[PDB]
């Protein structure tokens, strides 16, 4: 089997760290696995080089910035090849341009267009470990490019798709993706497998370490993704596609906006949300129930930072379209159960509502998906709701 | 005609149930859906907007084969808890934009509502998820709505 | 016209320093000159990268070492491109692979085989300044290579040859090449022009600053070479092809070996020097005069570090070929006059011997070239001989 | 023929002059070459090896047109300063390897002496410069010597 492994800046932050990465990679190769390793620049180099450029200009030239920042990964790919060769395991380093990770022309934010499997496949069949520079490529004209944040993660997943790897392993600080935030529920436990769809629905698990885009890419190409702690304490979590509920997700940074008595006619929903979109306000939830006497209510949710901007915009719309009023509330939290199998089982929503009612928590809003039920409650109840649902659905440990 | 999405999905086998003027107090959502679940009727969509003057409306969807059954349980619940009425509809379709992207809900939903609006398709219900925006419309307009959405967006 | 400029590590040591070179380049470009600039890594970067590799291994893998050290120049080319753009002069950086500097495979010591002029010529005709990373290229298989010490000097001259530039400018600390070492003769003068042949003949004027190989290369392809102080105090010196004597050269690190009474038969000269060459002793001077009674003497000169090795090898040979003795002396100095036009005029050697005779200096050995006379004298007289010759030839000027 | 050099040069217009047993004391090279220079005779090669028993030999070369003039001046100087004799030769040629590389005199010279020794060409004089190794041989052997050097070396 073929495996793609990606190592973050911390993992390769020092020579001592790189030597350790090599030792592990040695173990996989020793097991009969062909290995492709994706590495990032050692810690501080990417920020240090960017800082060197901003030292030169306030808005540094995107095309030239790419050739500066891209060098960091090139130092790293060589050291790990050396630390591997020293350990008796053959390795070859690859530049972005050497493999041929063909990309966009958007300079500090380039997107992968095509990856040549021919040169790497030959190195793998010759028994060598391929060490690829993460976060780089070149456009159709030969100009160097950088992917953007999470670029290395993207590269690893893109290599996994083009090479049709068995799985792509992302090494990081966390031991996996958990049933819920362990800071909130100490009995939260590590998950063995979840679908791409479940992982995306539990957004807050999405963070700085694993970029959301990476989860998105692997899903498009059915790339088995494993998240593990760098030192293999455990198997990690396998995110692939195929326990009544997988997990509990929540968001405390929410504010709700409702426009009441809206005329129930085509185009009105566009009038409500259109101007919000024009202002670049992120919208999370949108809820509209059935009209009565040709009027309805329309509610959506935004981050607290943008609450008043969205509210003043909505008040304008309520004046424009003749609605009864526009009102908002920032004292809310969103709590969700996600899991496949919700689709095949009756009563999952019943059990969630019962568990909230046992705790005297009033449900203000309900929104849904095939694999998700979301509830909006008063912010004070957030941790209690999360714990109530967590024992109720038997995820406790 | 440029925005990116994974696909457009729809379901013609859906029936809408609404219980209106339900008291906005803890335990009610369970009283409504508890007996539906006890009968083993599967539930797909559930929509509840904010309460006004201490009552709210609660809507859910079921497979068409369970409509008449769910309707009567809901009607009996409506009388038990003092709700105003229980109403049902079988002539609806659920159409969704999938693979939306979390930070982009305001963009794709704006385009979808716009596309529907160009044709005169009235939206009766809206629900959201991290990766989906879903709409409920009268069933007869489905084909026009799907064609409008295919023109409005770019499939990935 | 087209000028190629090379700036070393000190010249691009800091961002502040890089900024000035850009100003320097700006002036030329504004004058109607197409400019190609070759730059080195920022100060300390090349050594910092090597030491990072020795950290991994005792003998770091040559092919992978090339991938790491080459990155230093790649940072520098972008910064100077950015520093040029800010100033309002368009620039594009070129990695070695981009221009296409094709090379050899000797990884840490690669030799340039071919340079593509097409892409650079295009950027120049578009009116941009092309900044090329010195000291790197790629072999025929796509492997990154580094030129070795003095690589950037080599790169600039190679670009000058392949582009048929009007001249190649080497920027460094010295003001030019002098009549003689100023430490010895404070009245030494900066030279305007000397031939490649004179410059090579004055070997000690070639420091680490100007690699001798770089001068050799320029000579084979008639690349006019100028050496200047980085801040254009003056015209520098021009070395190209084409004053009684140009300069005075000397070497204190010498030792003479003589084998006396050698049989004057074909093949004996091979017997004397063959084994010296086998031991890798570098030899400077070789002097043999006409035989008398079918025997002659054979003398050569070596660095003092190799003296005892050479002497003991010679004694053995003297024994083998039946010579009368082999003798050595470490208490010698070599002083030379070099100048073109020596070929043209009579009596130049007379004047050199007279000046040494005025000073009571005994001449022990004489060796010659069309443009050079070399003398070997007692070591104590080195500075005096150089001064006497420097005034005799009116170089004080 | 592995070694690289720039080329093979030779000069057929040369005449050898040697004054033998000259006292090894300062000013003597000027006394020998002073009058030659006074006659305006140009000099090319000058070769002097180390003194032994307070005398040395001193050889130089001039254009063939000037041999007879140089020979007599040297003969008078030889008588003036007490040298043993002054002798001349016209039947000689100068052949040189150019483009040597200062680093490689030992290697190129070993190869040049070997190629000449494989033919039976006796080397009578050897002189050196930073970028050149020079040999003097009987003129009749010039063609054979040049071909041998070409065979033994690789040119640029
Ligand atoms: N049928 C629900 C389960 C809970 C419903 C309770 N009536 C679902 O699949 O989400
Ligand atoms: N031609 C000069 C120098 C000859 C010695 C070096 N080739 C002279 O006759 O003085
Ligand atoms: C309205 C209904 O949802 C009620 N708030 C509940 O908590 O069940
Ligand atoms: C209420 C609003 O959704 C309207 N029905 C529409 O179709 O836009
Ligand atoms: C003395 C030595 O030079 C000899 N004549 C030779 O030709 O090798
Ligand atoms: C012999 C000759 O070289 C003499 N020694 C001189 O010094 O002029």
Swiss-Prot record, chains A, C:
It catalyses: L-aspartate + ATP = 4-phospho-L-aspartate + ADP. Transmembrane segments: none annotated. The keyword Nucleotide-binding applies. GO terms for biological process: diaminopimelate biosynthetic process; homoserine biosynthetic process; lysine biosynthetic process via diaminopimelate; threonine biosynthetic process. CDD domains: AAK_AKii-LysC-BS (cd04261), ACT_AK-LysC-DapG-like_2 (cd04923), ACT_AKii-LysC-BS-like_1 (cd04913). Pathway: Amino-acid biosynthesis; L-lysine biosynthesis via DAP pathway; (S)-tetrahydrodipicolinate from L-aspartate: step 1/4; Amino-acid biosynthesis; L-methionine biosynthesis via de novo pathway; L-homoserine from L-aspartate: step 1/3; Amino-acid biosynthesis; L-threonine biosynthesis; L-threonine from L-aspartate: step 1/5. It is an enzyme of class 2 (transferase). Signal peptide: none annotated. Its EC number is 2.7.2.4. One of its GO terms (cellular component) is cytosol. NCBIfam families: asp_kin_monofn (TIGR00656), asp_kinases (TIGR00657), PRK06635.1-2 (NF005154), PRK06635.1-4 (NF005155). This is Aspartokinase. It comes from Pseudomonas aeruginosa (strain ATCC 15692 / DSM 22644 / CIP 104116 / JCM 14847 / LMG 12228 / 1C / PRS 101 / PAO1). The lineage of its organism: Bacteria, Pseudomonadati, Pseudomonadota, Gammaproteobacteria, Pseudomonadales.
């Amino acid at each position: 089997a073929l495996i793609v492994q990606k190592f973050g800046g911390t993992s390769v932050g020092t020579v001592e760290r790189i030597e350790q990465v090599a030792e592990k990679v040695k173990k996989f190769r020793e097991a009969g696995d062909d290995v492709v390793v994706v590495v990032s620049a050692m810690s501080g180099e990417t920020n240090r080089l960017i800082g060197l450029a901003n030292q030169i200009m306030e808005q540094p030239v995107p095309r030239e910035l790419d050739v500066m920042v891209s060098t960091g990964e090139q130092v790293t790919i060589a050291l790990l090849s050396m630390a591997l060769i020293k350990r008796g395991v053959p390795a070859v380093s690859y530049t972005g341009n050497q493999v041929r990770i063909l990309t966009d022309s958007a300079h500090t934010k380039a997107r992968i267009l095509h990856i040549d499997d021919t040169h790497i496949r030959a190195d793998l069949k010759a028994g060598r470990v391929v060490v690829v520079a993460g976060f780089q490529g070149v456009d159709g004209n030969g100009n160097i490019t950088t992917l953007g944040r999470g670029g290395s993660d993207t590269t690893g997943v893109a290599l996994a798709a083009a090479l049709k790897a068995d799985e792509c392993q992302i090494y990081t600080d966390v031991d996996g993706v958990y049933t819920t935030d362990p800071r909130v529920v100490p009995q939260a436990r590590r998950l063995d497998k979840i679908t791409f769809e479940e992982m995306l629905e539990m957004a807050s698990l999405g963070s700085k370490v694993l970029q959301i885009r990476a989860v998105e890419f692997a899903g498009k190409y059915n790339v088995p993704l494993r998240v593990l702690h760098s030192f293999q304490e455990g198997p990690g979590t396998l995110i692939t596609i195929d326990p009544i509920i997988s997990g509990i997700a929540f968001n405390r940074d929410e504010a709700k906006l409702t426009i009441r008595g809206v005329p129930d006619t085509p185009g009105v929903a566009f009038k409500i949300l259109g101007p919000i979109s024009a202002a670049n306000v992120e919208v999370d939830m949108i809820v509209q129930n059935v009209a009565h006497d040709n009027t309805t209510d329309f509610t959506f949710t935004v981050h607290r930072n943008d609450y008043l901007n969205a509210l003043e915009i909505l008040k304008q719309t309520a004046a424009n379209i003749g609605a009864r009023e526009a009102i908002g509330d920032t004292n809310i939290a969103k709590v969700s159960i996600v899991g496949v199998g919700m689709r095949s089982h009756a009563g999952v929503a019943s059990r969630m509502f019962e568990a909230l009612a046992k705790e005297s928590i009033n449900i203000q809003m309900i929104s849904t998906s095939e694999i998700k039920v979301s509830v909006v409650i008063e912010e004070k109840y957030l941790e209690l709701a999360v714990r109530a649902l967590h024992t109720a659905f038997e995820l406790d440990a | 005609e440029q925005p990116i999405i994974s696909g457009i999905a729809f379901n013609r086998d859906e029936a809408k149930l609404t219980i209106r003027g339900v008291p906005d107090t803890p335990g009610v959502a369970f009283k409504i859906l508890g007996p539906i679940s006890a009968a083993n009727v599967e539930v797909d969509m559930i929509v509840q907007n904010v309460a006004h003057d201490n009552t709210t409306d609660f809507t859910f969807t079921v497979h068409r084969n369970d409509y008449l059954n769910a309707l009567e349980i809901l009607k009996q619940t409506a009388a038990n808890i003092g709700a105003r009425e229980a109403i049902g509809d079988t002539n609806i379709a659920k159409v969704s934009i999938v693979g939306v992207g979390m930070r982009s809900h305001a963009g794709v939903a704006s385009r979808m509502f716009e596309a529907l609006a160009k044709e005169s398709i009235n939206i009766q219900m809206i629900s959201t998820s991290e990766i989906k925006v879903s709409v409920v419309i009268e069933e007869k307009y489905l084909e026009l709505a799907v064609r409008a959405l295919h023109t409005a967006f770019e499939l990935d």
